[model samples]
Target: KDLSTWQTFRRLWPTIAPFKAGLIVAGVALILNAASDTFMLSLLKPLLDDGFGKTDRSVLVWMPLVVIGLMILRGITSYVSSYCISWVSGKVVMTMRRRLFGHMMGMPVSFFDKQSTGTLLSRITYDSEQVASSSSGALITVVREGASIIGLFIMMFYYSWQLSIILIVLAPIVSIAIRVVSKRFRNISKNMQNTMGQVTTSAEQMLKGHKEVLIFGGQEVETKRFDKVSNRMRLQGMKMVSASSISDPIIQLIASLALAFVLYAASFPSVMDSLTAGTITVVFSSMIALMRPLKSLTNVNAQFQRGMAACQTLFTILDSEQEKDEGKRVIERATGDVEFRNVTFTYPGRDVPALRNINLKIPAGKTVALVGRSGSGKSTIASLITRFYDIDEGEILMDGHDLREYTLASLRNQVALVSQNVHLFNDTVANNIAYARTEQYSREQIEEAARMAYAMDFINKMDNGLDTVIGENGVLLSGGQRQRIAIARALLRDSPILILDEATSALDTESERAIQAALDELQKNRTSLVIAHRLSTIEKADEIVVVEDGVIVERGTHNDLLEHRGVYAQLHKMQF
Candidate 1:
C-alpha cells in the first residue's frame, strides 16, 4: 500500500529526531522574535499618549532607546533562528541521502533493471533537496510566522475585544483559501519532480554518449528532446506560482474587508466611548501587523505541500522490499562443485523462460564451456550461478547443498566473474585491481595478480606504473587494457569458482594468446564456466555444452562432439 503524505512524514521523524536540541533552540529564538513585535506594539500606546500629550517628560528619551533596543534584539533572535533551522535541515538531508543510498545498494538486481541510473540519481540529488526545503525551510516559516500571528492576536484582543472579533469572524475564509492552494501546489510539485527526472535522464544519455550523437548528427534531435522536458518542468513551476499568486491576493483581500469592518464598528458612539486614542492606535497597528504574518502563513502552505510530495517519493524508495537473504548457513570456502537440475527461469515481466529444463554439472577443479548463439541462455547460466536472480523452477546446488541454503554473501564470495563489458572505477590501476578486497590484498599482491593477467606489461610502461589514475570506465586505456584490468580484478579475488563471459573477446589476436596462458594458469584447480563466441578459446575445456533456444542441444568433449556432427560440430565447422 502507498503511504499518505502525513504517513511519510511520520516515517521521516526518526531522521529528524536526533536534532531535538537544535530544533528547541530554534523554537525559542522564534518565540523571542515574535514577542519583540508585540513588545514594539506595547510601546505604541505610550509613545502616542505620553510623548505627544506631554504627560511624562522621561518618555521622550526612554521611548526611542526602548524601540532601538527591541529592534536589535529582534535582529539577533532572527539570525539565531535562521541559522539553527538551517543546521537541522542540513543534517536531515545528509542522513536521508546516506540511508537512501545504503538501502539502494542492497536492493535486488531486478530493481536496478527496472530503474534508470539518471532517475535514481535525480532521486538522491534533486528530490532530497526538495524535501529539505519542506522539512527545514517550511518548518521555520510556520513556527516563526505562526508565533507572530498568535502574538499579534493577543495584542489586538487586549486593545479592544470588539474590533478583534472582526478578524476572528473572517479567519475561516483565509483558512479555506490556503487549503485549496495547498492541494494545487502539491499536484504541481509532483509533476515537477517527474519532469525533472526526465530532464536528468535525457541530459545523462546525451552527455554519456556524445560521440554517438556527433557521429550521427543528432545534436538537433537531442536538443529538442531536452528542450521538451525542460519546458514541461517550467510549466509545472509556473503552475505552482499561479497557485501562490492567486492565493495571496484572495487572503489579503479578505483581511482588508475585515479591517474595513473593524474601522466602521470602531466609529460607533458606544464603541468610541469604550476605547482611547492610544488604544485605537495600538489595535490598528497590531491588526496591520497581522496581515504580513498571515500572508507568510499562506506561503508556508505552498512550501509545506512541496515538502510533503518530496517526502512521499523518498519514502517509497526507502520502504521498497529489499533483496531476500534468509539463509543462515555460512561457509569458509566452497568446494567449487556446481550443478543445475530442471532449472527453468523467466524474467520479472516476460512470458518466455530465459532458461528451460536444464541439467548440468561442473565437478570440483574442472572447467566447463558453454557455447551458443546470442540470446541462447549462455550468460543466463552465469547470472544464475552468481545468484543475480532466483530461478523460477528447480534448484542450483554447490557441493551437494542447495545454493539458496547458503547466505548470499557467502555464496557470492566463492565465485569471481569477468564479463565482456569491463566496469572500472575512475581510480588508480592498483586500486581497481584490488577493488573491494583492498584491505585483504597488499600492494605487492595486487601487482602479482596484474602480472598474472598480463596487465603489468602496460603498467610498467606507464608514468605511474600501477598507481596511474585511470579515467572513468578506463577510458584512458585501450579495450585490451580494460579487459586485462577486469581479469586482474578477478584473479585478485582468487575464488574457488570463476566465470568468464567473453572475458577475452575484447583483446587483439596477440593479446588473446598472451592472456590465454594467464587464463590457463588461473583456471587450474578451480571450477570454471567459460562462455565464448570464439570456439577455439574453449577447445581445451574438459567438456563442451551447446545451448540453443534455452535448451541444451549437445554436450561432449570437443573431438567427440566433432565426430558426432551435431550442433557443436556444426558451430565448430562454421567458426573454423
Candidate 2:
C-alpha cells in the first residue's frame, strides 16, 4: 500500500545526522510561527467580546502594539526557518550526489554492461534532488503545517467543542480522500521516474550518434524515437497533475460542508442563546484558516511519495557489490608466460557460452595470432587476458599462478593493449600517449615510442607538434593516426606482455609494415597476442591460432598450417 511508510527517515538518517541543529531551529521557528497566528486568532475573540463594545482606549493602543510586534517576530522566524531548511537540504543533495558518483566509479565493468550511460547518470542529477526534498522539505511541511493545525484545534475546542465535533468528524473523510489520491500518485511517480530515464537514454544516444544519424539519413526515425520517450514522460506528468488537481477541490468541498453545518447549527435558538458573538467568530474563522494548510498537505504527500521511490532507486545501486579485488599478491614485473587451462566463460545474462573448453599457451617471448570471423569470440580473448570478465570453468595463469591471485593494478600493469577501438582524450597528443604512465615516463621515452610506431612522421606535421590537441574542438586525428597514438602508449609502457587486437587495421599496407618492422625489434623478451582479420598482417606471427564459434579449431605456424589445409588454410584462401 502507498499508505505504508517507506524507510524515509531511516534512509536519510545517515545524511541528516550532522544537520540536527538546523532541524531543531527550523522546528522551533515553525511552531512559534503557528503560536503567533494562534495569538492573533485568540485576540479576535477579545475584540468582539469587550474592546469594541467599550469606549476604553486600552484595546486600541495596547492590543495593536503587541500584534505588530508579534508580526515582526513571525517574519524573523519564517526567514530563519526557510534559510536553515534550504541550507541543510542543499548540503544533503550535494553529499548524496558525491556518494553516488564515488560508488559508481568503483563498480565492475560487468555492472555497467547492463545499464545505459543515461540511466546511471540520471540518478545523480534528478533522483538525489527528489530524495533531498523528501528528507527536509517534507519535514518542514509536517512540522509547520501540523503545528498550525494543532494550535488552531486548541483554539476551536475552547470556544465551542460542539461545533469542533462537526470539523473533527469530516477530517478523517478528507484524509481518506488524500490517501486514495496519493495511492495513484505513488504508482505514477515510480513510472514517471522510469519514463524520464528512457527519455534521457534516447537523447544521449541520439546526440552522441548525431553524425551517424545524419549520414545514414535517419533523422525522421530518430526524431520519432525521441518523441516516443518524451511523450511517455508527458503522459506521466499529466496523470500526476490530474490526480492532484481533483483531490484539492474535493478536500476543500468536504471542509466547506463542515463549515456549512456549523453555520446551520449556529442558527438554532438554543445555540444562539448559548453562544456569544466572540465564540462564533473564533470558531468560524479558525475553521476557514485550516483549509490552506490541509489542501497543501494533500499535495505535498505526492512529492514525498515520489521522492521515496527515487530514494529506493538510488539505494539499490549504491548497495550493489563493486568489483572483486581481494588479491593480496603484488608483482613488480610478470614473466609474460600466460596459459589458459580449459578456460570457458559466458556473459552475465547470456545462454550460449562465449568460450568453451579453450586451451592455449603463449610461452614467454613469442607472438600468438587468433584469427576468426566476427562474433567468433576473438575479442573476448583480449577481454579475458585483461581480466575484464572472470572465467567460469578454469584458471588463467600469469607466471604459473591464477590471474586473480595478483592485485588488479599489478596484474593489469603487466599487459598493454592497443585495440582497434581507440579512445583519445580532448587533450594534446603528447598527453594522450603518456596518459597511462604519466608518473613514470619522461619526455625522451615518449618521443622514442612515437618514433618507434612511425607516429613521429605526422606528429612533426601537426599544428603544435607533440602538443597538438586531439579531439572534438581540436584537431581530429584520423583513424590510422589515432591507432598510431594508442600503439605508442603500449610501446612507452614497456610491459612484458602485449595484446594487439587489430592494432594495424586502420593503416595502409606500407604503413602497417613499417610499424610491424619496428614492433619486430620491440617484441624481444616479450610475449604478444595479436588478433587480426587480415591474414596478411599476422603472416609473420610465430603461432596462428584459428578460432571458429568459441572453439580453437586449429593452431600452427603460417606455412605449417597452410600445408595442413585446415580452418586457418580456409581463412587464408578466402582472404587471398
Candidate 3:
C-alpha cells in the first residue's frame, strides 16, 4: 500500500526540524520575493494608466526608477531564498542518506541476500535524488507561489469584490483538475520507479555476465530483452510528460476564459459607466499579471504527486521488519562455544530450507572442519554461526545463553570471518585491515596482524606498502593478495570465533600453503568453523562434519570418517 501525500510528507518533516531557523528565513525570503514580483507588476499598471495615459513625463521618470528598485529587491530575495532552501535541503538529505546507509549496514545478512544490488542502489542514488529535487522544488513553490496567489486574491477583492467573487467561484474547477490529474500522475510515477529498478538490474546483470553471454553467443537475445525494458521505461516516462503537458494548458485555458468573460461583462457601457477607463485598465492589468501566480499554484498539484510517489517507495524501505534485539545486557569476551539444536532456516521466497533440523556442538578452542560439495549447506553453516538468519525451528546458543540473549554488537564482536570472495575498501591497506578495530588498534597493531597472516611479505613488496591507496575492493591487487588482505583484516579483529569459507580456494599451491600455515596459527586457541572442498587441508581437524543434501551424514575424526566409508569416504576417494 502506498502512503497518502500528507502522510508521506509528514514522516519526512522531522528531518527538517533541526534546521527550522534556516527554513523560516528561507520561507520569509520566498514570500518577500513573490510579493515584490506581484507589486512590481501592480506598479507598472499605475505607470501606464496614470502616467502614460495622462502624458505625465515626470510620473513616467519616477515610476520607472521605482520599478528598477523593485527589480533589485526581487533579485536579492530570489537569491537568498533559493540559496537558503538549497542549502537546507542538501543538509537534510545528507543526514537522511547517512542514517539510511547506517541502518542498512546494521540490517541482517538475509536482507542483503534477498535484495538486489541495483534496487538498493536506486534507493540510495536515484530515489534519494528524486526526494531531493521534489523536496527543494516543493518548498520553494509552496512558499513563493502560495504567497503570490493569496496576495493577488486580496488585490482582486479590493478592486471589485463582485468580479473577484466570480473568479473565486472557478476555484472548484481548478481543484477538480488537480484531484483528477494528480491521481493519474502519481500512479504512473510509481510504475516508472518500478520499471527503472528492473532496467538497472537487467543492465547490471548483463554487464557482470558479459563474458558468459559472449561465449554462449546470446548477444542478440540479450539486446532484444534490454530493448524491451528500455521501451517500457520510455513509455512510462512519456505518460508522465503527457499528463503534465495536457493538465497545465487546460487549467490555464479554463482560468483565462473565465477572466475574459468577467472583463467583457464589466467593459459593457451600461454596467461599468460609473468606472473610469483607468479603473478598467488597472483591473484588467492586475488580473492578467495575477495569472503568473495561478499558473504556479496549478503546478503544485503535480509536484506534490511526484514527491509523494517517491516518498512512498522510500518509506517502504524504512519500515521493513527488523530483527528483534532482546538482549538488554552485554556478554563481554565470549568463550566461542557454539551449539546448534535442531536449527532450521529458509530464505524468504524459497520453499526449501537452507539448513534443516541440524544439531552440532563445537567446543571452545577447537578447529572443526565443515566439508561438503557446493549447495550442500557448507556456507549456510558458516552463515548460521554468525546468526545471519535466526533459526526457524530451534535455538543456537553461545556460552549457554540463546544467541539473541547477547547484544548483536557483542555477539558479532566475537566472530571474525574470511570468505573466498574478498571485499576491501578503496583506502590504504592498513586502514582496510584496521577497519572494525580502528578505534582500538594502532598502525603497529595492524602491521602485526598483517605479519601473522603472512600478508606483510606482499605488503613490503609494494612501493607504498600499507600506505598504498587500493582501488575499489582492492581490484589493483592480485587474487591471492586480496585474500591475504581479507585474512589479515580478520586477524586484526582478534575475535574468539573464526569462519573461513574457501578462503584458500583461489590461491596457488605455494600461496595456499602459506595461508594454510597462517590459518593454523590463527585457529589455535580459537573455536573455528572451516568450510573447504579440499579434503587434504582439513585432515588435522579435531572433528570433521560430512554433510550432503542439507543433512549431516557423518561426524568424527578424519580417520574415523574414512573408516566409515560413507559420504565422506566417497568424497575422499573421489578427490584422492
Candidate 4:
C-alpha cells in the first residue's frame, strides 16, 4: 500500500473498481443535470424578451409554463445524479475505513506502545473524515462548476465575442488570490490537526484518571491547561474564517467590476444597434448564472489545500516503519525449553542497557524463578523471552531453535504471560476467558480453565454468571478478581511456557493462597518463569536465579541460594 495520504486515493482504487458501473452512471447523470441547468439559463433570454419585452399577450401564458417545466426537469436530473454519487461516495469511504482498521490491528505491540489511544483514534476518525468529505465535495463542485463555466462562456461568445474578451482579465487576479489564501489555510490546517490531537490526548488522560484528578483537586489546573490548547484551536479556526471571508468579497468585487465594464461597452449604438433584445438578455442572464459557481471555484481552493495538509499528516503514520517479523517457521507445539545466552538489551533512546550478558536455561516442564531489586533486569528478561523486543545482543532459543526463526504468532502461541498489572477486555467473563482459545477451544474447555484458575467461584456468584459484562479494562471487578480472570485466560491457552511478572502482587494473603494453590496445579507439566517480589512465592521453584545490576549474582534452589550467603542471602535477610 502507498503510505502517503494523497496516495490513499490511488491505493483505494481496487475497492472502488467493483462499483465502476455505478460511478459511470452517476457521471452521465451529472452531465445531463448540468446540461439541463444551462438550458434553463439560456431559455431565460426568450422568456424575458420575446415573451415580455415585445409585450406579446399570448406568449406570456405559455412562456411561464415552459420555464417552470424546464426547472422541474432540472430538479429531477439533479436528484438522480445526487443519489447515485452519494452511493458511490459512501461505499468508497466504508471500504477505506475497514482496510485502515484491519491494517492497524495487524501492527505490532511496540507500534501501539509508541502512541496513545486518542492519537491513533484521531487519525482513523478525523483524517478519514477529511478525505471522504473533501474528495466527494470537491468532485461534485468540479463537475457542476466546470459545466457551468463552459456553458456560460459559449453563450457569452455567441452573444458578443468582444465582451467575452473583456471578462478574461478577471481570471488571473482570482487565481493569484486563491493561491495566497490557500497556502495560509494549509499552514493553519496543519496547526489545527496538532491542536486537536492535544485536546483528544488530554481529554483521554483526564477521563482515564478521573478518580486521581478529583482526589488531588486538580480540576481547575487541568481545565486551565486544556483551555490553553482549546484556545489555540479556536484562534486557528478564526484565522481561516477571516481569510475566507475577506477572499469572498474581494472576488465578488472583481466580478462586479468586470460586469460593469461589459455593460458600459455594450451601451454604445455601434454595439447595441444590431443586437436583439433576446440576445442581450441571454448574455446578461448567463453572466448572472455563472457568478456563484465562479465564486465557488475561487473559494474551494482553501478546502483543497486544507485537505492536502491533513492527508500529509495521515500519510506520516501510515508510512511509519513496522517492526521486523520475517520468521517463516511454524511450531505446532512448543517443548517449553527456553535459554538466554549472554543476552543484552537497551530500549530506544536510553543510555543504560536494561539487561547485559544474562545467561540462563530452563528445561522443559521445569519451574524457574527470577529474584532482583528494582532495575535489576528481571522484567526485561521476561519481555525478551516473549519476543516483545529483539535483544541488543545474544540470542534466546526455544526448543533448541533461535526465537527469531519462528513466526510471531507461532512464538506467542507457545507462551502465555501474566503481568503484575493484569488487563481484561470489556466483555463477558466467558468471552474474556475464551479469547485465548477462540479458534481452538470449546465452551466446556473455557469453563474448565476458569475453574482451574480459581475463578469459577466468583463467576458463579455474579448475577449473570459467566455472562456478566466487565467494564472497560475490567474495572467492574476487584484487583484479585481481575488477576484471576487474566490467569484464567492464560490457563485456557494451555501453552507449555508461562511467564509471571509478579502476577500475584495484586492479591491479598488469602487470595494469594487460593491463587497459589491453583497455580501449583496449573504449573505441574509446564515450564514456568516467575519474577517474584514476595520471596514466599519462589520457595518451591526448581531453581532460583538472583540478579543484581543486569547480572546474575547467584543461582541455585531456594535453600541452596540462602546457603550461598550472597545477594540472595542478603535479600532473604532483609525480608526476614
Top-scoring candidate (TM-score): 1
Give lDDT tens digits, candidate 3, residues 1-576.
655666777888887788787778887887788789889878677666666666567756687678888999999998887788788778877876886787677777778887898777666766666666567657667667777777778987787676677677788887788778877878887788888887888898887677789898977988998899999999999999899888889888877887788677666775453555566667678888867776776677676677677777777778777776888658788897899888887877789887778778889889888887677788877777777777788888888888877888788788889976777889988889888557789989999889877788889988898999888768778778888888788878878888888777776777666777776875578888887788777877889987776777799999898889988899889989
What TM-score would each prediction reach against the true structure? 0.90, 0.84, 0.86, 0.86
Better lDDT candidate (1, 3): 1
List per-prediction Cα lDDT, in the order shown.
0.83, 0.82, 0.79, 0.77
The C-alpha stretches of model 3 lying farther than 4 A from their native spots are 30-74, 151-169, 210-226, 260-289, 509-514, 521-523
Candidate 3, residue 518: the lDDT equals: 72
For model 4, the stretches where C-alpha displacement exceeds 4 angstroms are: 1-19, 35-76, 150-173, 254-289, 436-439, 511-514
- Candidate 1's TM-score reads 0.90
lDDT of 1 by residue, 1-576 (tens): 234556677877888899988888888897798799888888787667656665465766687788898999999999998899899999998988998899989999888999888988888888888878888768778877877788788877776786677678777877667766776777788778877889899989988898888998966988998888898899889888887888888888998898888677667766464646567767877788877888888878888888788787778778899987988798977887899989898989888888889889999988899887787888888888888998888889898989888998888888889976778999999889998777889999998899888888889999999888988778888778998899889889988998888887887777776677777875678888888888877878889998898898888898899999988878778889
RMSD of 3: 3.8
Candidate 1 vs 4: which has more lDDT:
1
Can you list the residue pairs that collide in candidate 3?
none
Question: For residues 341-403, what per-residue lDDT tens digits would candidate 4 score against the true structure?
Answer: 888888766898877799999998788898878768888888888877778789888999999
Which stretches of model 1 miss by more than 4 angstroms? 1-5, 33-77, 147-172, 261-286
Whole-model lDDT, model 4: 0.77
Q: What global local distance difference test value does model 3 have?
A: 0.79
